[PDB]
Ligand binder design. Structure first.
Ligand SMILES: O=C(O)[C@H](CCc1ccccc1)CC1(C(=O)N[C@@H](Cc2c[nH]c3ccccc23)C(=O)O)CCCC1
Ligand SMILES: [Ca+2]
Ligand SMILES: [Ca+2]
Ligand SMILES: [Ca+2]
Ligand SMILES: [Ca+2]
Ligand SMILES: [Zn+2]
Length: 316
């Protein structure tokens, strides 16, 4: 829409109050004009037809429960845009300020979220397994990171390259969560998963095996489900990334941690300069060592920590 930029107030999925950027033109729309070419949030109205209607509201107050998922999808996309821009100098997902679009209320009881090659899409959850998926800042950032990858390395979504694609999204979704300082951890989707059970998540980066995912290359899933286990084998990369940042001894290999900023930056450079659609784990190791080299010098600790971490998980 064409209108006047304004600020509204609402409540997210978890009950927290936030300000959101809106546009005024008869109605108040979920259209944020302060970020690149815009952030836009749509109502899919429990249907599967995308994107749905641009979200319209009469009074600029989004306190209704049906409003919750839209508040969070809109707000978290902003934070994620901010992260890339401020931290990595990247303007939107394509590096050229593309508009960011999300739809909420997709389908009925849909326990998932996804990037469809053009926009983000969020289900409401069935109310037991998940609550509306846009309430998790790591989920929102994992999704927007698929768009970043699509525009950069272009990692094919299957087998090793697909598990690298997944680790990327979990790594950057976790860095966005620490960035916003919203109770940060090294778990994925804890805020929206099993509202009933406290303490769990979808996946663990710190200990992938907690939920049965591999944490060593020797334990790689070699079958065909999940596109050749893109959501499984990502645990091997995730654990490497956790060790680079935090440190530790894993399978007898000791890794000194270099912290999360440095982790973000080595991975961002590997992603944007070195990785290709068909990269495998072993190529991701060469890419990460080369980025850390570029950045900190050959005889650095940073380079050393990258090598140890990949040796710790069995990659090369
Ligand atoms: O982006 C992704 O990688 C996942 C998108 C998967 C998707 C792909 C194509 C069509 C529809 C859905 C969505 C997320 C994911 O990891 N989904 C997993 C785990 C999961 C979520 N809900 C589920 C319900 C059933 C089974 C698995 C799941 C999966 O689809 O495997 C990312 C973080 C939050 C949800
Ligand atoms: Ca209202
Ligand atoms: Ca958290
Ligand atoms: Ca998390
Ligand atoms: Ca839970
Ligand atoms: Zn994903």
């Amino acid at each position: 829409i064409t209108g006047t930029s304004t600020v509204g107030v609402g409540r997210g999925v978890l009950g927290d109050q936030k300000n959101i950027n809106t546009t005024y033109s008869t109605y108040y729309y979920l259209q944020d004009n302060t970020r690149g070419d815009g952030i836009f949030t749509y109502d899919a109205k429990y249907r599967t037809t995308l994107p749905g209607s641009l979200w319209a509201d009469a009074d600029n107050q989004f306190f209704a429960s049906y409003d919750a998922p839209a508040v969070d999808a809109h707000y978290y996309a902003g934070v994620t845009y901010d992260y890339y821009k401020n931290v990595h100098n990247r303007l939107s997902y394509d590096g050229n300020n593309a508009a960011i679009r999300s739809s909420v209320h997709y389908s009925q009881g849909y326990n998932n979220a996804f990037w469809n090659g053009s926009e983000m899409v969020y289900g409401d959850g069935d109310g037991q397994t998940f609550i509306p998926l846009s309430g998790g800042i790591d989920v929102v950032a994992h999704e927007l990171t698929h768009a970043v990858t699509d525009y950069t390395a272009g990692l094919i979504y299957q087998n090793e390259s697909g598990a690298i694609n997944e680790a990327i999204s979990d790594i950057f979704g976790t860095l966005v969560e620490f960035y916003a300082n919203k109770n940060p951890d090294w778990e994925i989707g804890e805020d929206v998963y099993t509202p009933g059970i406290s303490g769990d998540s979808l996946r663990s980066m710190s200990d992938p095996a907690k939920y049965g995912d591999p944490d060593h290359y020797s334990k790689r899933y070699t079958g065909t489900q999940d596109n050749g286990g893109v959501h499984i084998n990502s645990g091997i990369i995730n654990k490497a990334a956790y060790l680079i940042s935090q440190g530790g001894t894993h399978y007898g290999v000791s890794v000194v941690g270099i912290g999360r900023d440095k982790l973000g930056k080595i991975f961002y450079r590997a992603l944007t300069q070195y990785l290709t659609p068909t990269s495998n784990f072993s190529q991701l190791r060469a890419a990460a060592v080369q980025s850390a080299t570029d950045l900190y010098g050959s005889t650095s600790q940073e380079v050393a920590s990258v090598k140890q971490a990949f040796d710790a998980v069995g990659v090369k």
